[PDB]
Ligand binder design. Structure first.
Ligand SMILES: Nc1nc2c(ncn2[C@@H]2O[C@H](COP(=O)(O)OP(=O)(O)OP(=O)(O)O)[C@@H](O)[C@H]2O)c(=O)[nH]1
Ligand SMILES: Nc1nc2c(ncn2[C@@H]2O[C@H](COP(=O)(O)OP(=O)(O)O)[C@@H](O)[C@H]2O)c(=O)[nH]1
Ligand SMILES: [Mg+2]
Lengths: 191, 52, 102, 49, 430, 439, 61
C-alpha cells in the first residue's frame, strides 16, 4: 500500500488485459509476473504471503484480484461507495510500517534523551556545524554510509563517545539494517 | 479367464489374490506385493483385508 | 480519482415537493467556475420508494436531517424552507433540528 | 432411498388393486431390475507382481 | 468484440433511446450510478458491445445524442438513468429546424454536422473491431429526418463495409400531428433507400392499436409505446450478446433476409404480449408463441400482411427450448399458410435460439418479416404528397432554402419506382 | 503407434466435437481435467489412448484435435466449461468476425488470415505422431464458415500431405426442415469442393435422427445434444477397432479399399443399432440377429433416404461386444435370403464384417442404456441420388431469378462459379445412374 | 378521492401495462444457459445404477 501510495502506480490496467471476460480471476503465475513487473520489490516469503487466501480453494492455479484491487485502492480514495453521505474518506499521509526493528522496545529511551541533551549542550557551547561533511561523504545524496565512517566525522569534530551510548544511538538511528542516515540525525540535534 | 493351475478345473476368483502369496500363470510363479488404494478399500468392505 | 486537489466532491441541490398532486422535483443551482454542466436533476414526476415499484413518496416521508433514496442515490436533507416549517406545525408533524451542510 | 409411495389411501383404492396384492413377496418391489453385468460396470482391481 | 455504437436523432429518437438504454441497463444489471450490481456471470461477458469502461469502475454507453434544439436533451438528462451519458457526446444547435427538412438538411444541419461527425469518428475508431451502427429517428420531423439522413449518407461514405440499421417511424394518416409530414417523409425515404443497409418501419397508429386490443389497457402513453419499441429493438441483437444454440447476428440476418439490394424494409413484432389480469392463466409454449407471432394484428405496422405475400421471415427465440419443436412449428406454419408465402424460394423462414430469456419472462420471440404488404404505406404517403404538391402548398418554405421543385419531382419518381419494382416480385412466378 | 487427428470447424463441428471428446474421455478413463486418477483404474492394457491422446511426459493427456471458428462465442463457452484444462490453449483457434452464412466470405475474404495458423497447428500436431492413419474432419455443410473453411482446409491438406486419408462427417440439410434460407447454394458449392478432396463422406442429416429419437428413445422435445451423442456413439463404434483387440480388426485404410468402387462415388449413409432406453432395454435378449435386422431396417438410417428406392453397392458392418462369427454368418445369410433387399449383380459378395470385444460405454445423464452387443453400419447404395436431385431442384428454384447472388459476388467470387458446381452435381447424378444400371 | 387527483405531470410519467411482469413467469435463472446443463455438470467415473419404477401414472407435460 505504501509503495503504491508514494510511487503512484495504477495496477488497474495491467490486470484487465489478462481477464478479457470480466471474470475477475487470473492465473497465479500471471499475477506473480504482473506484480513483479510493476517495479515493486518482491520477496519469496512476501510472495507466498500474498498467495495466502487470495488464491481460490479450488487447485493452485486461480487467483481472484478484485478483492486485492479493492484492498489496495482504498488508500487513494473511498471510490467504492458513494451512496452514504455521512461516511468520509481520509486524506493520506505516509503510514510508517510498524515493526519491532524500528522501535526501541525496551524502555531505556530516557538515557537517549540525556544523550540528546548532552549533545545539544556541547554543540551549542562549541557552536559546531557539521552537516557539510555528512552531505559531502555520500554521493547519492539520499542516505549516509554505515557507522564505520560515521564515527570518523563525529571524532573529527572533537566529540567522541564510548561503546555503550554510541551503540544505543546507532541502533536508534539506523535504517534498513546497515545504512545510517544523517538528515534525521541533524533534525534531532536541532536547536 | 484363467484356469486354476492346481488342475481342479475351476476358474480363479477374488479370494485367490493375497499380498505375499504366490500364484501360477502358465508355468510361472508370480509373487504379489502391493495393490492400489481402491482394491484395498474393496477387500476391507467384504471382510477379507489384505496384508501389509 | 484523478483530481490532484480533491478526493471527494459534494454536490448540493434543492428539493421541491408539490402538494397539488404529490410530485417531487429536484434541481441543483449553478456555481461560477464550477466546470460542471449543472441544471435540472430530476423532472417533475412521482418517485417510488424503490426502483421499479409502485410505492410513491408522500409528504409525511419527508423530514429535515434524514437520509432519502432517489433512484439509488442517497441524499441528505440538511435544511428546509421557512414556509415549510409552518406547514408541519400546522399539520401537527414534529420536525428535527437542522444541521449544516459540510 | 426408495420413492415415497406413502400416499396409499384405502378410500380411493380400486377394486383390482385391492384384490391383486403382492403375493409371495414381503412388500411391493420398487427398484427396476437390472442384470448383473450392468451393475458391475467399470469395476477393476489392480495388483503389483 | 464486434461492438456497435448508437446515434440518436430528433425528439422522437431521443425519447425512444432513453427507454432503450433503461431497458438495456436493467437487463445487464447496471444501476443509474454506473455501478454493476448483477447476479449472473453472463451479464458481464459481452458488455463491451454497448459500453465503455472508465477509470473508477463505472460503465458509460457509447451513445451519441445529436439534435438541433437543447430542450429535449435537457429533459432526457433529468430523467432516470440520464446520468449515464457522457456530457461530451451531447451535441446541439440553438436555432432549430422547425419541421423543415430543407432547413435541417441544407442550412443548419450541413453547418452543424462537423462536430457530430468528429465525435462519431472518435467513437468508431475507439472500438477494437466495429460491427455496425444502429440509428433511431423519425421520418415525420424536420431536424431528425434531415440531419439524420445526411449523417447516414456521410457515415456510409466513410465506412462502406460496415452495416447500417435504422429504426424509422413513418407518419400515418389516421394519427397525424403535423401538416407537412408527406413532404419530409418522401424526401427522407429517397435518401434512406440508397444508403441504409437495414430499415425497420414503426407506426404510432399500429402501436396504439396493439396497446388497445392486445394489452387491453385503458390509457396508452408514449412511455408504453417506447417500451414496445425498446423491447423489439433489444430482441434483434440479444443473440449477439448472449450464447445460443444457433448463433445469428445482424450480418447473418441481413444476408438471409435481403433477396435483392433495394428491398431492405422490414416489419417487426414481439411476443408474448398479455394483459395484466391474464398473465397467470396463459401458458407459454412454442405453438402459442408462434401463433401470436404470426398473428396479423400483433405486427408493429399499419401494413396488413395478408394483402401481400411474405418474401422471407425471421424469428429470434429466447430461453431454453427444443430446436426440433421450433422447426416443426415453423414448418407447420409455412405449410398451413402456403398462400401467403412466395413460392420460387423454398423454405423461406429462418430460425434462431438464444438460451438467456428476457428479464422477467420464461420465453420470448422477436419477429422480423420481409413482406410485400408494406407497399400500401408508400402508396398512401405518395397519394397525400401528390395531393398537396399539385397546388404547391407550403412549398415556399422549402424553396427559400436553395432547393427547387426538380428534387421533389425526382424524389416522387424514385419513390414510385421503388413501389412498382417492389410489387413486381409479388406477382412474379416460376 | 497408430494416430488420427480430428478437425472441428464451425459451430456444428465444435458442438459435435464436445460430445465425441467427452465420450472418448469417459471411455478411456481420463478425468475432465485431463489427469488419470492415481487409484481406481477402469481398464487394463497400455497405449489404448495413444490413438486419440498423447502423453505429456508426466501426468495428463492432450487430445489430438484443433477447434476452428470465426465467432468467439462457442470457443469461449468451451474455454469456460469444465474442459478448460484439457485442451491446449493454442488449438482453440478463434477469429473476430463471422462469415455470416456466406461461402464467399468464408472462402475468399476472412478465412485466408486464419488458414495459415490452422495449417501451422496441423503441422505441429502431425510432427508428434509417427504412424498417422489419417484425418477426421467435422463440419455442417449448410453453413458459410463451415463449408468455406472446410473447403480451404482440405484443399491445402491434399497438397501438403498427399496420399494421407481424410474422413469427412458432414451434416446435410433436411429435405424440408431447415433453419436458414440460402443453404442450398453453399451446400452445392461445398459438395463441389469436397467431392475431389474427400476420401470418405458420411450423410448425417438431422430430420432422420429426429425421427429415430422420437421412435426408439421416446423423446418428444430433443435438443441438439442428443443428436450429437448419437453421432459420437457412431464415431466411437467406428474407431474402437484401432484401440481395442478384436477377432477381426479393421483399419482406416480398410474402408476405401472395400466401400469405394470408383473414385467419384464415395458418399455413404450410416445406420446404428440398437437404440433403446433403459425402461425397455432389459426385457428382450437383444440378439445379434434382431440387432442386425434393426440395422438393416430402412427407417433407422441416420440420413433421410430410402434404401428401397435403389440397389446396394457394398456394406460395412462392425459389431462390438460378445458377438460370435457364426451368428454373424447366419445373420448375413438371412439378410441375403430376404427379398426386399437387393444388391447389384457385379458385386456378388457385398459385406465386410468386423468383430470387437469392447462393449459400448454409457455416459451418465444420457439417453441410451447399457447393452452387451451393438452394430454400426456404413453402406453405399444407389439410393443416394435423391438427395442430390432435391437439392439441385431447390438450387435451380432460387438461381433462376439470380436471388441472393450479389451477396456472394461482392466477396470476390466470379459469376460462373455456381454454374460449374451445378454441372458437377448433374454429372454426379449421371454417374450414379450409369453405375446403377444392369448388365 | 378516486379520480380528482389526476394531473398532467403525474399521468404522463407512469407506466400502466409495461411494469414488471407478474411472478410465476420470472422463474428462470438468467445465469444458466446451454452447454452448462450437461457439459458443466461434473461427470463421474462411477455412476449410480439405481433406477426406480413407481406405481404412479407419469404426469403429462
Ligand atoms: N447436427 C447438428 N447440426 C447443427 C447443430 N448446430 C447447427 N447445426 C447445423 O448447422 C447449420 C448452420 O451452420 P451453424 O452450425 O449454425 O454454424 P456454421 O456452419 O459454422 O456457419 P455460421 O453460422 O456462419 O458460423 C444449420 O442448418 C444446422 O442444421 C448441432 O448442434 N447439431
Ligand atoms: N413513439 C413516440 N413517438 C413520438 C413521441 N413524441 C413524438 N413522437 C412522434 O414524432 C412526431 C414528431 O416528430 P419530431 O419529434 O418533431 O421530430 P424532430 O423534428 O426530429 O424532433 C409526431 O408525429 C409523433 O407521432 C414519443 O414520445 N414516442
Ligand atoms: Mg455461426
Amino acid at each position: 500500500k505504501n509503495i503504491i501510495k508514494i510511487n503512484r502506480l495504477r495496477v488497474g490496467e495491467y490486470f484487465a488485459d489478462y481477464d478479457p471476460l470480466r471474470k475477475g480471476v487470473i492465473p497465479t503465475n500471471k499475477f506473480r509476473g504482473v506484480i513483479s513487473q510493476m517495479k515493486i520489490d518482491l520477496d519469496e516469503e512476501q510472495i507466498l504471503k500474498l498467495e495466502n487466501m487470495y488464491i481460490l480453494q479450488s487447485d493452485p492455479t486461480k487467483l481472484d484480484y478484485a478483492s486485492f484491487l479493492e484492498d489496495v485502492n482504498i488508500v487513494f480514495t473511498k471510490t467504492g461507495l458513494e451512496k452514504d453521505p455521512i461516511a468520509k474518506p481520509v486524506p493520506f499521509e505516509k503510514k510508517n510500517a510498524i515493526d519491532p526493528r524500528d522501535v526501541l522496545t525496551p524502555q531505556e529511551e530516557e538515557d537517549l534523551h540525556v544523550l540528546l541533551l548532552r549533545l545539544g549542550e556541547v554543540i551549542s557551547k562549541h557552536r559546531i556545524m557539521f552537516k557539510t561533511h555528512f552531505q559531502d561523504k555520500d554521493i547519492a545524496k539520499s542516505g549516509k554510509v554505515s557507522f564505520t565512517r560515521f564515527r570518523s566525522i563525529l571524532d573529527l569534530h572533537k566529540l567522541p563517545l564510548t561503546d555503550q551510548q554510541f551503540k544505543l544511538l546507532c541502533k536508534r538511528f539506523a535504517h534498513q539494517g546497515v545504512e545510517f542516515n544523517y538528515i534525521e540525525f541533524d533534525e534531532v540535534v536541532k536547536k | 479367464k484363467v484356469l486354476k493351475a492346481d488342475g481342479s478345473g475351476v476358474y480363479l476368483s477374488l479370494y485367490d489374490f493375497q499380498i505375499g502369496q504366490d500364484l501360477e500363470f502358465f508355468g510361472k510363479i508370480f509373487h504379489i506385493y502391493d495393490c492400489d488404494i481402491y482394491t484395498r478399500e474393496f477387500y476391507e468392505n467384504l471382510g477379507i483385508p489384505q496384508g501389509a | 480519482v484523478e483530481n490532484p486537489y480533491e478526493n471527494y466532491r459534494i454536490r448540493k441541490c434543492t428539493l421541491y415537493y408539490y402538494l397539488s398532486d404529490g410530485t417531487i422535483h429536484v434541481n441543483e443551482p449553478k456555481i461560477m467556475n464550477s466546470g460542471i454542466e449543472q441544471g435540472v436533476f430530476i423532472k417533475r414526476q412521482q418517485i417510488p420508494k424503490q426502483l421499479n415499484s409502485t410505492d410513491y413518496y408522500t409528504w409525511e416521508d419527508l423530514n429535515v436531517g434524514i437520509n432519502i433514496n432517489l433512484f439509488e442515490r442517497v441524499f441528505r436533507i440538511v435544511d428546509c424552507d421557512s414556509f415549510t416549517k409552518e406547514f408541519f406545525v400546522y399539520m401537527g408533524k414534529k420536525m428535527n433540528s437542522p444541521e449544516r451542510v459540510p | 432411498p426408495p420413492s415415497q409411495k406413502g400416499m396409499f389411501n384405502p378410500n380411493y383404492m380400486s377394486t383390482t388393486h385391492d384384490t391383486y396384492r403382492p403375493v409371495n413377496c414381503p412388500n411391493d418391489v420398487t427398484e427396476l431390475y437390472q442384470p448383473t453385468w450392468v451393475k458391475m460396470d467399470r469395476q477393476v482391481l489392480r495388483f503389483n507382481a | 468484440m464486434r461492438e456497435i455504437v448508437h446515434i440518436q436523432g430528433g425528439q422522437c429518437g431521443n425519447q425512444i433511446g432513453a427507454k432503450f438504454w433503461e431497458v438495456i441497463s436493467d437487463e445487464h444489471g447496471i444501476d443509474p450510478t454506473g455501478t454493476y450490481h448483477g447476479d449472473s456471470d453472463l451479464q458481464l461477458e459481452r458488455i463491451n458491445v454497448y459500453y465503455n469502461e472508465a477509470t473508477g469502475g463505472r460503465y458509460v454507453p457509447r451513445a451519441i445524442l445529436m439534435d438541433l434544439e437543447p430542450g429535449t436533451m435537457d429533459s432526457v438528462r433529468a430523467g432516470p438513468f440520464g446520468q449515464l451519458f457522457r456530457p461530451d457526446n451531447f451535441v446541439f444547435g440553438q436555432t432549430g429546424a422547425g419541421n423543415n427538412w430543407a432547413k435541417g438538411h441544407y442550412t443548419e444541419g450541413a453547418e452543424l454536422i462537423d462536430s457530430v461527425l468528429d465525435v462519431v469518428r472518435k467513437e468508431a475508431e475507439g472500438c477494437d473491431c466495429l460491427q455496425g451502427f444502429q440509428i433511431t429517428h423519425s421520418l415525420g420531423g424536420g431536424t431528425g429526418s434531415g440531419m439524420g439522413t445526411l449523417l447516414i449518407s456521410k457515415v456510409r461514405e466513410e465506412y462502406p463495409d460496415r452495416i447500417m440499421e435504422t429504426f424509422s417511424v413513418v407518419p400515418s394518416p389516421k394519427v397525424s400531428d403535423t401538416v407537412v409530414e408527406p413532404y419530409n417523409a418522401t424526401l427522407s425515404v429517397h435518401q434512406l433507400v440508397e444508403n441504409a443497409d437495414e430499415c425497420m418501419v414503426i407506426d404510432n397508429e399500429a402501436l396504439y392499436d396493439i396497446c388497445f386490443r392486445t394489452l387491453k389497457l385503458t390509457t396508452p402513453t408514449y412511455g408504453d409505446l417506447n417500451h414496445l419499441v425498446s423491447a423489439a429493438m433489444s430482441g434483434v441483437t440479444c443473440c449477439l450478446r448472449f450464447p445460443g444454440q444457433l448463433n445469428s447476428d445482424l450480418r447473418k440476418l441481413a444476408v438471409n433476409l435481403i433477396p435483392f439490394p433495394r428491398l431492405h424494409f422490414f416489419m417487426i413484432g414481439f411476443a408474448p404480449l398479455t394483459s395484466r389480469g391474464s398473465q397467470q392463466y396463459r401458458a407459454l409454449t412454442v405453438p402459442e408463441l408462434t401463433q401470436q407471432m404470426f398473428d396479423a394484428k400483433n405486427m408493429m405496422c399499419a401494413a396488413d400482411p395478408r394483402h401481400g405475400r411474405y418474401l422471407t421471415a425471421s424469428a429470434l427465440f429466447r430461453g431454453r427450448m427444443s430446436t426440433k419443436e421450433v422447426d416443426e412449428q415453423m414448418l407447420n406454419v409455412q405449410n398451413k399458410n402456403s398462400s401467403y408465402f412466395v413460392e420460387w424460394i423454398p423454405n423461406n423462414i429462418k430460425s434462431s435460439i438464444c438460451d438467456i430469456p428476457p428479464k422477467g419472462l420464461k420465453m420470448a420471440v422477436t419477429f422480423v418479416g420481409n413482406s410485400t404488404a408494406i407497399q400500401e404505406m408508400f402508396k398512401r404517403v405518395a397519394e397525400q404528397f401528390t395531393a398537396m404538391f399539385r397546388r404547391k402548398a407550403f412549398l415556399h418554405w422549402y424553396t427559400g432554402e436553395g432547393m427547387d421543385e426538380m428534387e421533389f419531382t425526382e424524389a416522387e419518381s424514385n419513390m414510385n419506382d421503388l413501389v412498382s419494382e417492389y410489387q413486381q416480385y409479388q406477382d412474379a412466378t416460376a | 503407434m497408430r494416430e488420427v487427428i480430428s478437425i472441428h470447424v464451425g459451430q456444428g463441428g465444435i458442438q459435435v466435437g464436445n460430445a465425441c471428446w467427452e465420450l472418448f474421455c469417459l471411455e478411456h478413463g481420463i478425468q475432465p481435467d485431463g489427469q488419470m486418477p492415481s487409484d481406481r483404474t477402469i481398464g487394463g492394457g497400455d497405449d489404448a489412448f495413444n490413438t486419440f491422446f498423447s502423453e505429456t511426459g508426466a501426468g495428463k493427456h492432450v487430445p489430438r484435435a484443433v477447434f476452428l471458428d470465426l465467432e468467439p462465442t462457442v470457443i469461449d463457452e468451451v474455454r469456460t466449461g469444465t474442459y478448460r484444462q484439457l485442451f491446449h490453449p493454442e488449438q482453440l483457434i478463434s477469429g473476430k468476425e463471422d462469415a455470416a452464412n456466406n461461402f464467399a466470405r468464408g472462402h475468399y475474404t476472412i478465412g485466408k488470415e486464419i488458414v495459415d495458423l490452422c495449417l501451422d497447428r496441423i503441422r505441429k500436431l502431425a510432427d508428434n505422431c509417427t504412424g498417422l492413419q489419417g484425418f477426421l474432419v467435422f463440419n455442417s455443410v449448410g453453413g458459410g464458415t463451415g463449408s468455406g473453411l472446410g473447403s480451404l482446409l482440405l484443399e491445402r491438406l491434399s497438397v501438403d500431405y498427399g496420399k494421407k486419408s481424410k474422413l469427412g462427417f458432414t451434416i446435410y440439410p433436411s429435405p424440408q426442415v431447415s433453419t436458414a434460407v440460402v443453404e442450398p447454394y453453399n451446400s452445392i458449392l461445398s459438395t463441389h469442393s469436397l467431392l475431389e478432396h474427400t476420401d470418405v463422406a458420411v450423410m448425417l442429416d438431422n430430420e432422420a435422427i429426429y425421427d429415430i429419437c422420437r421412435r426408439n428413445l421416446d423423446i418428444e422435445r430433443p435438443t441438439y445434444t442428443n443428436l450429437n451423442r448419437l453421432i459420437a456413439q457412431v464415431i466411437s463404434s467406428l474407431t474402437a477397432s484401432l484401440r481395442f483387440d478384436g477377432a477381426l480388426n479393421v483399419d482406416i485404410t480398410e474402408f476405401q479399399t472395400n466401400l469405394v468402387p470408383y473414385p467419384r462415388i464415395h458418399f455413404m449413409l450410416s445406420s446404428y443399432a440398437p437404440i433403446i432406453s433403459a425402461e425397455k432395454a432389459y426385457h428382450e435378449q437383444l440378439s445379434v440377429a434382431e440387432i442386425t435386422n434393426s440395422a438393416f431396417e430402412p427407417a433407422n438410417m441416420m440420413a433421410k433416404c430410402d434404401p428401397r428406392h435403389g440397389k446396394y453397392m457394398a456394406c460395412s458392418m462392425m459389431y462390438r461386444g460378445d458377438v460370435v462369427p457364426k451368428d454373424v454368418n447366419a445373420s448375413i445369410a438371412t439378410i441375403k435370403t430376404k427379398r426386399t433387399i437387393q444388391f447389384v449383380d457385379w458385386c456378388p459378395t457385398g459385406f465386410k464384417v468386423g468383430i470387437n470385444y469392447q462393449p459400448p460405454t454409457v455416459v451418465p445423464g444420457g439417453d441410451l442404456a447399457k447393452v452387451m452387443r451393438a452394430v454400426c453400419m456404413i453402406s453405399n447404395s444407389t439410393a443416394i441420388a435423391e438427395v442430390f436431385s432435391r437439392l439441385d431442384h431447390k438450387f435451380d428454384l432460387m438461381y433462376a431469378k439470380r436471388a441472393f447472388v450479389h451477396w456472394y459476388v461482392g466477396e470476390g467470387m466470379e459469376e460462373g462459379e455456381f454454374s460449374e458446381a451445378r454441372e458437377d452435381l448433374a454429372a454426379l447424378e449421371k454417374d450414379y445412374e450409369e453405375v446403377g444400371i444392369e448388365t | 378521492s378516486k379520480k380528482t387527483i389526476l394531473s398532467g405531470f403525474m399521468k404522463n410519467n407512469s407506466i400502466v401495462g409495461f411494469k414488471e411482469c407478474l411472478d410465476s413467469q420470472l422463474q428462470l435463472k438468467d445465469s444458466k444457459s446451454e452447454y452448462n446443463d450437461k457439459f458443466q455438470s461434473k461427470n463421474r467415473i462411477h455412476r449410480d445404477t439405481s433406477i426406480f419404477h413407481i406405481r404412479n401414472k407419469s404426469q403429462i407435460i
